[model samples]
Target: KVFGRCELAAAMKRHGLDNYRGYSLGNWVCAAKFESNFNTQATNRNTDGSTDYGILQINSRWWCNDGRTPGSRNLCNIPCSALLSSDITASVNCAKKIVSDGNGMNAWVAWRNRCKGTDVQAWIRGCRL
Candidate 1:
């Protein structure tokens, strides 16, 4: 199943993420596998007395103060949940935004290389999905 809707894809394209056609779900899965194990609802208590949550290791308090909407539906647009609920496709689109609203995959690459705890380029090269 794809992560985002056609409108979402269009939004991403409009935002400048023009490389979706060449995106790789494998790379996303691989990165997520090592980073958060593909878990949308994961959290970590930092040794520095901070809190990290969701996929992509998004820090909730850093963005949304409460980490939930009115009803707490885990809305992906809410930063923390956004990165967490993002499947492979959404993750790529998200990476584009993280890099530069709509630009290169360097941030994703960097994340994979440094924070993701694995071979960043290998993930891209091995993207099979």
Candidate 2:
């Protein structure tokens, strides 16, 4: 399943991403926009041998385990498969955890390279909150 822009905004807010660690809903929304285009089942394999899973692109190298990624810590302690679902609570919660994992919001490079110096608010503008 995929999310519309406003739908993702409301969902992130409901999951407590509003101004989390000084990162706004716009920031989260922006990152997700470029990360997975709001596709819940999106998957990308990294050059580093880790797999990125779900809408927020939780990484298997450190966050989730796919029974692959040989050295993965499985820090989130769940199957990477769990992150891809229409019900994205696991994905959202894992993103929250990943952000605070000392990697901070830089966990998503798209957020840094694209969303970093921009007016993140634009990501959520006209969404009617």
Candidate 3:
């Protein structure tokens, strides 16, 4: 599912992305914007052959097991396919897990490049929440 900006903000907020690991709602929104364009089924394969999956573009190498990445750690203990759904529960939860594991949101390169160290309020400005 391709989610609108505010729509994604609300959905992610419902999963507690707001203030999560000190990341504001806009930060998460911006990350998703650059990473997946808020599409639940987004995926990208890195040169290392590890794929990123879901709205968060979670890595298959260390987060989810795609049954393809060689010696993947699967730290999130879920199938990579689980991240590619409209529900977003697994996607959001896994991102939280990613943060708690010391990666912060930097696990996503888009976040590091675009969402980091910037005033990201614009991503959530028009949202009612």
Please give, for residues 42-77, the per-residue lDDT of candidate 2 as tens digits. Answer: 999989989899998888988898988989998878
| Candidate 3: segments with Cα more than 4 A from true spot | none
> What are the RMSDs of all candidates, in order?
8.1, 1.1, 0.9
**Roughly what TM-score does model 1 have, to 2 decimal places?**
0.42
TM-score of each: 0.42, 0.95, 0.96
Residues 20-63, candidate 1, lDDT per residue (tens digit)?
43543334445445456555566676555445554445444433
**Ranking 1 against 2 by TM-score, winner:** 2
Structure candidate 3, residue pairs in collision: none
Query: How do all the candidates rank in terms of lDDT, highest first?
Result: 3, 2, 1
**Residue 5: error of model 1 in Å?**
20
Q: Which stretches of candidate 1 lie above 4 Å from their native place?
A: 1-25, 67-95, 101-129
How many backbone clashes are present in model 1?
Answer: 1
Reference-based TM-score, model 2: 0.95
lDDT of 3 by residue, 3-23 (tens): 999999998899899999898
